[PDB]
Design a protein around this ligand. Sequence first.
Ligand SMILES: Nc1nc2c(ncn2[C@@H]2O[C@H](COP(=O)(O)OP(=O)(O)OP(=O)(O)O)[C@@H](O)[C@H]2O)c(=O)[nH]1
Ligand SMILES: Nc1nc2c(ncn2[C@@H]2O[C@H](COP(=O)(O)OP(=O)(O)O)[C@@H](O)[C@H]2O)c(=O)[nH]1
Ligand SMILES: Nc1nc2c(ncn2[C@@H]2O[C@H](COP(=O)(O)OP(=O)(O)O)[C@@H](O)[C@H]2O)c(=O)[nH]1
Ligand SMILES: [Mg+2]
Lengths: 439, 430, 430, 103, 97
Amino acid sequence: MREVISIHVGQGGIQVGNACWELFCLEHGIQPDGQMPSDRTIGGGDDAFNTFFSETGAGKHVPRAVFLDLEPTVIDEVRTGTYRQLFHPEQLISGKEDAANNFARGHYTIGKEIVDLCLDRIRKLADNCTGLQGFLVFNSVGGGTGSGLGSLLLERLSVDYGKKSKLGFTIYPSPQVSTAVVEPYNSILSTHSLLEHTDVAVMLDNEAIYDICRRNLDIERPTYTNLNRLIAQVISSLTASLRFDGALNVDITEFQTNLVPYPRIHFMLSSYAPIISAEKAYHEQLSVAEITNSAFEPANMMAKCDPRHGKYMACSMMYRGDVVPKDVNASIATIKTKRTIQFVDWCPTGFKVGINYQPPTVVPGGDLAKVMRAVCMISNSTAIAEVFSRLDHKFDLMYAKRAFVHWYVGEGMEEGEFSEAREDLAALEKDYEEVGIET
Amino acid sequence: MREIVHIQGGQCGNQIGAKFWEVISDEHGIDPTGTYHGDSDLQLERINVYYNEATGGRYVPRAILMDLEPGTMDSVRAGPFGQLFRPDNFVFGQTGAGNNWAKGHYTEGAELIDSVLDVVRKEAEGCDCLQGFQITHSLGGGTGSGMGTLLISKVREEYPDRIMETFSVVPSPKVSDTVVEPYNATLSVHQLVENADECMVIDNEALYDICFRTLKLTTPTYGDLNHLVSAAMSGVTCCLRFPGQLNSDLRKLAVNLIPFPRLHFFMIGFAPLTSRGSQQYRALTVPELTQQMFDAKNMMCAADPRHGRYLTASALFRGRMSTKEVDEQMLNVQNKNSSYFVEWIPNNIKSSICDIPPKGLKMAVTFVGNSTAIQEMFKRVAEQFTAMFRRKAFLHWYTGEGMDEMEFTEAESNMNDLVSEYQQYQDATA
Amino acid sequence: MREIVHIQGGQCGNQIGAKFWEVISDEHGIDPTGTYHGDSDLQLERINVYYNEATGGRYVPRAILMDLEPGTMDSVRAGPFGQLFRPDNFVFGQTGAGNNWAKGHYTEGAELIDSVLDVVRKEAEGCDCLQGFQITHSLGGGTGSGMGTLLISKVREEYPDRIMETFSVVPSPKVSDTVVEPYNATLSVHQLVENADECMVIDNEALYDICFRTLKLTTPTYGDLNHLVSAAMSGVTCCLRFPGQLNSDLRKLAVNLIPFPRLHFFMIGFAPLTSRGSQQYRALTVPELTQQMFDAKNMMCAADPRHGRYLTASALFRGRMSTKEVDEQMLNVQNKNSSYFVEWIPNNIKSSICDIPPKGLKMAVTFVGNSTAIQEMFKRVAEQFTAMFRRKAFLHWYTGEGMDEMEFTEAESNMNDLVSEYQQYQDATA
Amino acid sequence: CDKYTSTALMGNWYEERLAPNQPFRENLQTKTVREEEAAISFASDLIPLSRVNRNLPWDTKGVIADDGFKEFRSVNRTSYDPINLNNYYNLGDCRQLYKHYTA
Amino acid sequence: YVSPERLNDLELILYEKIRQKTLPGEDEGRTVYRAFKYFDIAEKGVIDISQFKAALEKFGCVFDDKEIHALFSKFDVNRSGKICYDEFCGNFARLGS
Ligand SMILES: Nc1nc2c(ncn2[C@@H]2O[C@H](COP(=O)(O)OP(=O)(O)OP(=O)(O)O)[C@@H](O)[C@H]2O)c(=O)[nH]1
Ligand SMILES: Nc1nc2c(ncn2[C@@H]2O[C@H](COP(=O)(O)OP(=O)(O)O)[C@@H](O)[C@H]2O)c(=O)[nH]1
Ligand SMILES: Nc1nc2c(ncn2[C@@H]2O[C@H](COP(=O)(O)OP(=O)(O)O)[C@@H](O)[C@H]2O)c(=O)[nH]1
Ligand SMILES: [Mg+2]
């Protein structure tokens, strides 16, 4: 009865949609062709797949997902991949010409001819839905169509539907490990649109997850498929409470009332634990106290940001497995005790705890081992102003000489739009500075 | 499916195009008779990018072969893979250019250009979604340097927004085949800057140096230089035809490489290149590829890259690899060589990954770079031009075909301004 | 069942008719001896339109053969497919015309035409429901241009409600084979506009140009031109003989192509046409068929259709195809060339589909177009006529059979009036 | 080959012993390569273009030759590989208590 | 069991729909080759009866399993139960010429 709609746009958004939809089908025991294999299921999970799948009347189940991109390369390969028979044939919208790493192309010239189709598909999906909870958007901001089309979609959705909650899993460029050269231009402009249109933002940079794989899994040769599985695991843990029995259930609306103190401050960063391979897993204790301690370790964090340089505002605990509520309270109290991790004065209580009985599910051919306990941590902190600081530094350095500007003005963008994006992030960066002061 | 059309003019352009089509047909598994005999399904998914389909299951390339003399196209038809090209795609005169720019651009080229323009228009309107143009010619000759740039001007006037690519074999003073190169070379470079979106300069001397030092083969010929140029050209557009992790088309290269509208003269290179005697003694790892890629002696230009500073650069990795090493190696080469990269731009290297390497190879990389070391290429050409022009030598042929000294004066002034504005960034500091 | 009889006069008319009947016999699978040897019942279902019934189940065409000189019919009897013609239909003169309109229209034509009029009357009365007449002749000769048009006048007098077709070959200034052609050409045009319901101008110049340029064969003969004309003649009336998605007959074409009764001079073309070395390099599709249909160089007249404005247009398709493709192709060709279509008659193009392609082809197109650019031919012919007439050259031959200068003057005035009407309706606006 | 005819240990002798055949070099008498014929298509100026017997194609293969790598695989194709899902299904808990044949 | 002059009608109906679905500038043989190579996974070149039924179904032709055997039996000359779709596409391209 309760379910969410997922948005996957751009090259980065689709390629992480491959991993998550692999896990959701596997977690409910759904074959890639869509037929549940029975096997005396007799409603084993019964009514639990409506969050991510809908019955077709006789047999197969179809996901509540839509795919967008202006380059048919990634869309076509999904249509010819192992999951060809799963997705709806007309829900894999494919463009004609790629945005070509340009913000203006995907927002003013070719991005306006695809939104009409996408909005129609969302409307049809919503009408079939009955207990709509919100939207989940996956996109990459350091690119053309991801930042371009994604920003256009967010503006259209906010007016058409209104108060429905939106959560964005963005991918900002790393401090030094990055692909494109003109990405600061697109990254700055996209933050302008998403600041007043989304409700929860999670930072999912690339360099931080490279360190996680090397330090934990001891993988010196990682690719994107390794990273996407880690991001997919976070999504399932975050939304597990919506579709499984739990001692303390938290739905997506118990996030904005628990993690967002002010309307302009809704940017957060995530962490996940335990992260161990199949060789070292069975020689270790993996106690609840240890998994909750490693989640707060700064190098275990999923974004390249050091929490010791800032304070804390609100934290969310999402446990799954065989955890006991008494153990969680004792472990949490030790976290508050140590002086290295310091909170903010005006927030005497800062932990929201949710407990689920479902143990983590392991994908065959993966890197993680089958464990009995896991935790997902979402933290709102003032240290996030660090990553915005360096993006501003990169923008100003290459904008003083108007480099690469003619690529933007020649597509439809006005030159004055660059100044506005600078000012709002200039305002935003000092909002975090002002809140961090003490009374 | 975002197709590209091909145009080749002059003797050098025709030979380069023939070798390129041979390489592309071999890679896609198309026999000299035009019948598909490939191995995997991936070779046919995007074959429309380079080939048209006709009744009988045969594939014909969409290329236009143009010259003012029938000498070279007789040769391309007689040679191998000469039956692929459509007989309707050959246009020619009877006189030839004779290494005179005016003859190929004002009198004889203009008279013949209508038919080739008609053929180009028909071919362009045939495809569903045009993506751009690619040109192979030489600026040191008559019919190429003039007639090709006239066609470039016309087609750019007709199609304003499509990307245009040129592979110009600019002359070099170490190896000289003509006594009148500076005039028409300067004129063509003047005419090319206002129309071409991307230019990739090539020297015969540079490829001779590569063949002598890297391949270590005693007596190569134009066939091997043509093969190297064809390999680079094929490697440029790998992502437009094969799936990968980070797809980048022609337009994505231009945005990431062109900071200002008049700075679009690049230099290219290819890797790996090994001699026949040392093939099996080297490992296949990403560090080897980037080490050979940033080799100063591995470029396709006589100019030394380490005499200037790169503005931007691009690398197009092919084959199955780990993305982490790509980024780490780019960061390391950008850090240990911070003196050779301009400081007021951060992360001035772009990387792209394709899943399908060339046949018989595991990993291959194509490098495109935009540096300030190209200016010596124009510096020496203009130096010869003024020395030849002070005495008005060899000028009466040009002036006897409706051409005036004013055009030469304009051409030489444009070269100086381009060099100045292209080199001032080397000394400019933030 | 709405059958049509065939009339051909003069040497040119006989040569056209022989190959036309050869092509029709091949289409319907009739051997040279008149015995059916077909494969499908559709070939025999509608045989009565062209062939009568005779002994032994053999078929004979309902064609009348006429000329004043026996040599041409002596040749056509011994030519290929010469045994189909009934010996009674041969009508012969004993002297000849000698390229004289007066001789072929007043003295010998008048005394000879009674027998052929009786023969054609018998043939017309034989059929249960006549559909019309079609005539093939040349307007530059004497016997054809005179006696054929006198027969046209008599037939129009006797059978008013039926329709008349005239496949007429008019001379051009470039390929000229007669000195006295302007006189009888103008006189024949003035007589033809009187009675002919539809006129389809054919130029030997245009046929030679097509053979030289499109088919690219070095040594054309009159047989190739006859074959092209015969292909067009078979195509124009295919749907009346074979089933299709949208049936269309000659009366329907006349209704949809004739806005005013004095504007009935069409210009025709046929597609596709390819050389032997280019058959395998091209794909046969509706876009290419409709691209070749409207090509100016593909037409069978010296007039350029882009010098004027189309008033109406028609297209007849053969083979199996989707109707939506045809509809959108005609819509696109009308939209992209809005400057070449007069604007006070919207949707000035017609379409028809037949599902039986010609032998050896899968799809075929016949185009019939009414345009105001056809007036240039009449202008140049009248210019030559008046230049020759101001000095009364060669006028004694014409005045020696009772004809006077009043007929010349009235013919010239009527020709000028027709040209003026064409120009006036071309430069007309809403 | 340094002013010699190989088989002599002169400068740069080791590499050229591996040059495959180069048929052009030792057969400069044949010429031929006369397979164009009077095509009459490609072209007409009506005179077909004059043809001249061209020479041998000169080997090539300057780019590094094959290393016995067929390749033609995609990272996404090999990453998911429904064999993995097949093995995590309709299988397991096999410890070979008694001896039995299995696929 | 049913085998009158009805398999020919079913083949004619089958041919029209491939021509209807055929991409521009391509033969019906390539289009049906793409469908069979889409369904098959073993890449050996032969499929079973259910895959053939699904291939017919994607074209939009709906029939009961009874005649699916009848069509398959006509094409499977060797009675082996495995069909080489190469000959299938070749025959349908010849009929579509
Ligand atoms: N972690 C991760 N990041 C990705 C992945 N795919 C793309 N990205 C990010 O996307 C950024 C560049 O944008 P692209 O995804 O290549 O393309 P795009 O965002 O769709 O925009 P266009 O280039 O116009 O198509 C890179 O800097 C990557 O960090 C992925 O699979 N995993
Ligand atoms: N690299 C390379 N250069 C070539 C080839 N053929 C000709 N050239 C160069 O082209 C130049 C001559 O240009 P030319 O043919 O006269 O130009 P055109 O008169 O416009 O056709 C010479 O300096 C050669 O170095 C080739 O196959 N490869
Ligand atoms: N296209 C074409 N033109 C022809 C043919 N035969 C004759 N002509 C033209 O007709 C002209 C002579 O016409 P003529 O035979 O005197 O006409 P007639 O007096 O009525 O028989 C010549 O200039 C030829 O060009 C033919 O078979 N095809
Ligand atoms: Mg994209």
